[PDB]
Amino acid sequence: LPAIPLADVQSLSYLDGHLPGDMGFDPLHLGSGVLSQDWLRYAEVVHGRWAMLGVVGCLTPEALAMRGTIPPERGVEDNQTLLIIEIAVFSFLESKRYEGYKKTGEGGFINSYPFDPVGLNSPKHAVNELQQNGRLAMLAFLGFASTAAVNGQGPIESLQTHIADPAHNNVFTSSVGKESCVFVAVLSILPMLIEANKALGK
Amino acid sequence: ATEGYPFVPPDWAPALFVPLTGLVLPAVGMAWAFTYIQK
Amino acid sequence: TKLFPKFSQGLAQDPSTRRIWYGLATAHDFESHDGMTEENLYQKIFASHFGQLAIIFLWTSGNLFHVAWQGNFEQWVTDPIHVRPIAHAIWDPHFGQPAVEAFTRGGASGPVNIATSGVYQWWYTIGLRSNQELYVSSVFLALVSAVFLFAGWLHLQPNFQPSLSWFKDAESRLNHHLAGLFGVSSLAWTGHLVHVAIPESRGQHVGWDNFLSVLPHPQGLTPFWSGNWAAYAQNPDTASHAFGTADGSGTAILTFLGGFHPQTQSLWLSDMAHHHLAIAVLFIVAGHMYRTNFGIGHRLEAILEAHTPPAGGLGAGHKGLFHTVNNSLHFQLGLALASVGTITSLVAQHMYSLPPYAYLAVDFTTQASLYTHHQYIAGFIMCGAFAHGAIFFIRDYDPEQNKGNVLARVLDHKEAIISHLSWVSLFLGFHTLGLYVHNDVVQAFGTPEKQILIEPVFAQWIQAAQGKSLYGFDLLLASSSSPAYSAGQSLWLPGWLEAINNNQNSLFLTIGPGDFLVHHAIALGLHTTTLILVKGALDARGSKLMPDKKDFGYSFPCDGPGRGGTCDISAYDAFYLAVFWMLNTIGWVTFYWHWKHLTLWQGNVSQFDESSTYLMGWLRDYLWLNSSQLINGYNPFGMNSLSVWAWTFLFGHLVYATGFMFLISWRGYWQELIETLVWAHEKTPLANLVYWKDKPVALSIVQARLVGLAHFSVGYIFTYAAFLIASTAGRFG
Amino acid sequence: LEPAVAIGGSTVSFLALGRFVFLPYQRRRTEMEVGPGRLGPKTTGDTFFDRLQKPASFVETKSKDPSGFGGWHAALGHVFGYFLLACSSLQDAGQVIAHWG
Amino acid sequence: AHVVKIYDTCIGCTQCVRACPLDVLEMVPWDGCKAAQMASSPRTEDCVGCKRCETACPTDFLSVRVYLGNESTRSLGLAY
Amino acid sequence: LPDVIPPPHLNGTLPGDSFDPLGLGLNEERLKWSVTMGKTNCRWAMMAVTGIMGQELLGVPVKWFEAGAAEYDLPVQAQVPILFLVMGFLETKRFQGFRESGFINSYPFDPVGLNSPKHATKEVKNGRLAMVAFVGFAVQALVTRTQPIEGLQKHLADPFGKNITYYLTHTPEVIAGT
Numbered sequence A: 001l002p003a004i005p006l007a008d009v010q011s012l013s014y015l016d017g018h019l020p021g022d023m024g025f026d027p028l029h030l031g032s033g034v035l036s037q038d039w040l041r042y043a044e045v046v047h048g049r050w051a052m053l054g055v056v057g058c059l060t061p062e063a064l065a066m067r068g069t070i071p072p073e074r075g076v077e078d079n080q081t082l083l084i085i086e087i088a089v090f091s092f093l094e095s096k097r098y099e100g101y102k103k104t105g106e107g108g109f110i111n112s113y114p115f116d117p118v119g120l121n122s123p124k125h126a127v128n129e130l131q132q133n134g135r136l137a138m139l140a141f142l143g144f145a146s147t148a149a150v151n152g153q154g155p156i157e158s159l160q161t162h163i164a165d166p167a168h169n170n171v172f173t174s175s176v177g178k179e180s181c182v183f184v185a186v187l188s189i190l191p192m193l194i195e196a197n198k199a200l201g202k
Numbered sequence B: 001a002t003e004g005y006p007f008v009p010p011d012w013a014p015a016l017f018v019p020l021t022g023l024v025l026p027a028v029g030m031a032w033a034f035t036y037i038q039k
Numbered sequence C: 001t002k003l004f005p006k007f008s009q010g011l012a013q014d015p016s017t018r019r020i021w022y023g024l025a026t027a028h029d030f031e032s033h034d035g036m037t038e039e040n041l042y043q044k045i046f047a048s049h050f051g052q053l054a055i056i057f058l059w060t061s062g063n064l065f066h067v068a069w070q071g072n073f074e075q076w077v078t079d080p081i082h083v084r085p086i087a088h089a090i091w092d093p094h095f096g097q098p099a100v101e102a103f104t105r106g107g108a109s110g111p112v113n114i115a116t117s118g119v120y121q122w123w124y125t126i127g128l129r130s131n132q133e134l135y136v137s138s139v140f141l142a143l144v145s146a147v148f149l150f151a152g153w154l155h156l157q158p159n160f161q162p163s164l165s166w167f168k169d170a171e172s173r174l175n176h177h178l179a180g181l182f183g184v185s186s187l188a189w190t191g192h193l194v195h196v197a198i199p200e201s202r203g204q205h206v207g208w209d210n211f212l213s214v215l216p217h218p219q220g221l222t223p224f225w226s227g228n229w230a231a232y233a234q235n236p237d238t239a240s241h242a243f244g245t246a247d248g249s250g251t252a253i254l255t256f257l258g259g260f261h262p263q264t265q266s267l268w269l270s271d272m273a274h275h276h277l278a279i280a281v282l283f284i285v286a287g288h289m290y291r292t293n294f295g296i297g298h299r300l301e302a303i304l305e306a307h308t309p310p311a312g313g314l315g316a317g318h319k320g321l322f323h324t325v326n327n328s329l330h331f332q333l334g335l336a337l338a339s340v341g342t343i344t345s346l347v348a349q350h351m352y353s354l355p356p357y358a359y360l361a362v363d364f365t366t367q368a369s370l371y372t373h374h375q376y377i378a379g380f381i382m383c384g385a386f387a388h389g390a391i392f393f394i395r396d397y398d399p400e401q402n403k404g405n406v407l408a409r410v411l412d413h414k415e416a417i418i419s420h421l422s423w424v425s426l427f428l429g430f431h432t433l434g435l436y437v438h439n440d441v442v443q444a445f446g447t448p449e450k451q452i453l454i455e456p457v458f459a460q461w462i463q464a465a466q467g468k469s470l471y472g473f474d475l476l477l478a479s480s481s482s483p484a485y486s487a488g489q490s491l492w493l494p495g496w497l498e499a500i501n502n503n504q505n506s507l508f509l510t511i512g513p514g515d516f517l518v519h520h521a522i523a524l525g526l527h528t529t530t531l532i533l534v535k536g537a538l539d540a541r542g543s544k545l546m547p548d549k550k551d552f553g554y555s556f557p558c559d560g561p562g563r564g565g566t567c568d569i570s571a572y573d574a575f576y577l578a579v580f581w582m583l584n585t586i587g588w589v590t591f592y593w594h595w596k597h598l599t600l601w602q603g604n605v606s607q608f609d610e611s612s613t614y615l616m617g618w619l620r621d622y623l624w625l626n627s628s629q630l631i632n633g634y635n636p637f638g639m640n641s642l643s644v645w646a647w648t649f650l651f652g653h654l655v656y657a658t659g660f661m662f663l664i665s666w667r668g669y670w671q672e673l674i675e676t677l678v679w680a681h682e683k684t685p686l687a688n689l690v691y692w693k694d695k696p697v698a699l700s701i702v703q704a705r706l707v708g709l710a711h712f713s714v715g716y717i718f719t720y721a722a723f724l725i726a727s728t729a730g731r732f733g
Numbered sequence D: 001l002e003p004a005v006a007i008g009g010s011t012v013s014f015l016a017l018g019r020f021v022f023l024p025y026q027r028r029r030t031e032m033e034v035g036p037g038r039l040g041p042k043t044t045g046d047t048f049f050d051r052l053q054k055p056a057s058f059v060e061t062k063s064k065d066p067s068g069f070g071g072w073h074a075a076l077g078h079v080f081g082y083f084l085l086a087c088s089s090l091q092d093a094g095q096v097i098a099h100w101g
Numbered sequence E: 001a002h003v004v005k006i007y008d009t010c011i012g013c014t015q016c017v018r019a020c021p022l023d024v025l026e027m028v029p030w031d032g033c034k035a036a037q038m039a040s041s042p043r044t045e046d047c048v049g050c051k052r053c054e055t056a057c058p059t060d061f062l063s064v065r066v067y068l069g070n071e072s073t074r075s076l077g078l079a080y
Numbered sequence F: 001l002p003d004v005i006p007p008p009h010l011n012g013t014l015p016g017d018s019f020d021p022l023g024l025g026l027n028e029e030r031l032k033w034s035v036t037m038g039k040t041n042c043r044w045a046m047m048a049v050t051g052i053m054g055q056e057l058l059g060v061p062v063k064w065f066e067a068g069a070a071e072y073d074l075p076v077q078a079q080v081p082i083l084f085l086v087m088g089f090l091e092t093k094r095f096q097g098f099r100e101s102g103f104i105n106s107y108p109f110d111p112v113g114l115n116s117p118k119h120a121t122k123e124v125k126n127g128r129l130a131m132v133a134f135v136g137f138a139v140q141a142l143v144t145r146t147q148p149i150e151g152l153q154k155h156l157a158d159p160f161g162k163n164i165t166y167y168l169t170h171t172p173e174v175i176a177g178t
Ligand code: CLA
Pocket: B018, B019, B020, B021, B022, B023, C093, C094
């Protein structure tokens, strides 16, 4: 909580900073319930897990020469029946995770094993570094998804083009997104408006 | 779009905006209004 | 104890449905809210004003956006006579196969509806020619709407809320409104007319990228700073001149040509600039009349105190009227509504006779829809003016302040005023109905010669005095030796005479014996509505049947069934009764307008002139003949574009009939019925588990009158709008 | 016709008129009129910085009742009453305004 | 509930107390009329607003007035 | 301290001290905020006018008004987004300083050990003069369609003729450039 998102922003009253990743940013008051924010937090961390694994899941195949840069299932060895066993094994695993989460919270385990500290590592800083890296990968995966604007260019390949020309190869001009300028415009003026509103309403 | 950006809307615009303000918006509006009417 | 009516603890402590309904009724009566002071009242009004401005600008921005996205504006500019304007697109999952095939009009890929607002001609006249200019201007209007919303919130904050004297300052308000809002805005508009509208009408493209490099006039301000101001009117646009290109164009900007344009049938664009410029100079020079914080100007209180005739004509004159007007809000609201309602009708009467937009006279549905819309709006605003006058007399009229003045003096002979209004209304009603029934019976006995036909020798005389040489009155402006004809003979009289002598436009239509009776019907409706409203306003604070009416408020049910019965005795009830008469009067004036133009547009002007004298002729040739294509919107042989109008034509009838229910049936019958339903829900199995949070009760007496009037007015409006647009759109363009 | 002599000979005539023969009549005529205050309320203690009449001395500088802003106010007669005569270009532009009859 | 008022122009005929169907008005002694009694209204919270007292009032103008106001369960005449 | 015979200011501890015929102040909070506006507006105008003069003296076939469109490696499309972030950071941080009071740049005060005490009235006065000079540059550039040095040269070359009045009377030649 002392860091704060833009310059000096009054941190929300509900966020006392008790949570390890309280950057002080939480707009529209989506989470303010005591029992609801804990579950939302569990969602955010589970998201980061799937997304971090995802970011490095596309990074490996993309770096080397292979197929599926944009579309998966070029061949494979199991069709449709595979998908059924996928949902079955995941349903059993997920039911165990939900049962474990209800008992202690911050469910970090594989199958049915309440706490999973195999490596014996679990300090506070590692809890925090999990969150910050998950937030980063959740915001990086969208750029991997944003390959649509860049079309055939892949994640590693989009980086290569941007290296060749740093001014005519960006979202602001080389992409079809001309509204990105308006996004950064309103994202730049929004802070000042919050400070302005709160200041005026003395 | 192209040379028309200033308020030029994509093709599936009424197919996703009319199903929104005609069912989702009056439902959330009436729900919030009913909870505000009662104590 | 609930918390929804935050402004009223009395309604907040109501254990019935009456709390909900009333919670939506007194939401804007800031003068009767719990714990409200004069300063708080004025500040709340100042905020709601900004909210209204923001929603107005947002609405017009949305109109520009929809026409720029789905309207065929670029296709309409290249051919403003054949193609039809497009309002917006239609997306309905309820539509069938034939509805999608039949709703596609105007050269579109999907189903759309033609626009009757007439904004295409307005934008094409002011200068908008591309589909992008509407886009950029729509985002500009949305931006200014956002600023107004911020301004309203900004002023609702401490150290930013204006004081009471700032609101109670009329001298600087009138000075700034007459100089800046009315004059500077008009000067900026004539600047746009001379810099963009005039060159765009002559093919010269002028936009934000080249308006600083193109001079509006060849001379270039050189005559404005020199004694040669007539240089701006050297070569006007000739007759053979196209409105899109420079074929036959001119270089003049501030001309003075009477009449219209030979191709667009509208006023010369080089004349509206001159008009707005003269109006701007007049308003700016008139805005320096009152005294602000300087050593010059006038004082409104001093002028009002000095305006008192001697020999006791008005007694105290206008003494105390300044404090009476400035201290009250309903007086200012009634005056503003009266002025706005009068100028709205003025706008309606001048737009059809003198069309100001290019290719507007060709569009027959646009003119009818615009005239009907402006006249109905004017009628509702005119009823509101008298309603607020009655509210003023009840809420803020203290008799001890203005003793013996004109306001207290007109109240002394309210019986004389009301009685003379009653006599005028009875005279017009008896005679107009008698002449119509006499002509009807005589026409029904197979003898049309016997019917009485009065030629309006007064309005025909006015038309002959203004230029029309059809009647034969050798008077001024129609002669050749009158001083008024020689005056202006070289200024605007040739164009004005050429436009008034043509029998194809709408400028001073040829009247006859059929317009005499209709004009008398219009006079009857006006005097009757004025009688109801004036009687409800003067007898608002007391009567001989109820002298303490002022102690009961403005909208009460009655004062029991005693003393004969006092049903509908409040001034609210009087206004309620006057709404019906206002609707009838506006219906009569619009029926007259639509039939005269409906017979003029089809070259059968002799149909209305000989079939408008009897009411059976009205019902046959107007309501029955022009409704052949409207009801044929959907039959067992399919449907067409008019089917939507046919559907809403019946939808209006259903709303009207539902209003008759709330008007005829009264609350007690319904109260007993609701009680029986309560017993039913309480003693029923498997449904007694649920229960109402608020006790169900019948609507109140005042609420029942309001809902019935709303249903009556909505049906009356929807049915006529459907018939007008369908009957005009169905057989014309 | 000449703009220099029609708006110049105008200003001085409107100024000398307002300073020599219409000044005591204007001052005697403006005495019955009151200022902007709503019958004199408290201003300085209520923050009414806009209604209060502008100071800037506002005292006698000339003789027989002077005018600081009246010299710029009454001077508008120069353009209100004679820029019309100065711009009388219709006397040589063919558009006759004599109004025969 | 509704606000009932009794003015001094009362003659003490005791007709409003007889016309009231909810026992709202009463007759207290007075020293300003021939009957030496004036009406009063102690049970104002039980006023329903049927205005029968105003019809029973014989003096001109009425000595008793029923000014309607806020509604409660008792003043709305609800039996449920 | 004063200028002429009318009574002085309502508050007199600020650098500039004169009269105002409209009196837009009379609110200590609005006075403090408004005095900051004067210093920051003058800061931008001082830099702007000295920049226009420099661009005019050095040159690169483009006037400050026509300087909007003149090539560049990075296009105006990406120019705005980068400009907003930089300006948004700097300006929002600067507003942070005002809450704790004082004028700050990168951080609070930003005084690189230079004269400050009595050296202030000159800073406000120089800023005010640059503000009125910039509005003159703009209307001068709009009316004459030239740069302030060329306009000074045109007035230096001929004084009685080729004056401001000349620029109002002739527009068909000034635009054409004849
Ligand atoms: C105002 C906005 C609005 C909109 C957008 C719609 C839209 C629609 N209406 Mg409708 N309606 C409206 C207003 C509106 N209505 C009003 C005001 C009325 C009162 C007069 C009606 C009365 C009305 C009637 C009487 C009927 C419709 C019907 C329909 C549907 C058209 C027929 C169809 O294709 O079936 C839809 C076919 C589908 C495949 C849609 C399925 C998707 C639905 C909407 C949601 C189902 C998903 C489900 C929740 C999954 C759950 C997820 C789970 C994992 C938890 C359509 C989607 C018809 C209908 O419903 O069809 C039976 C129909 O009978 N409407």
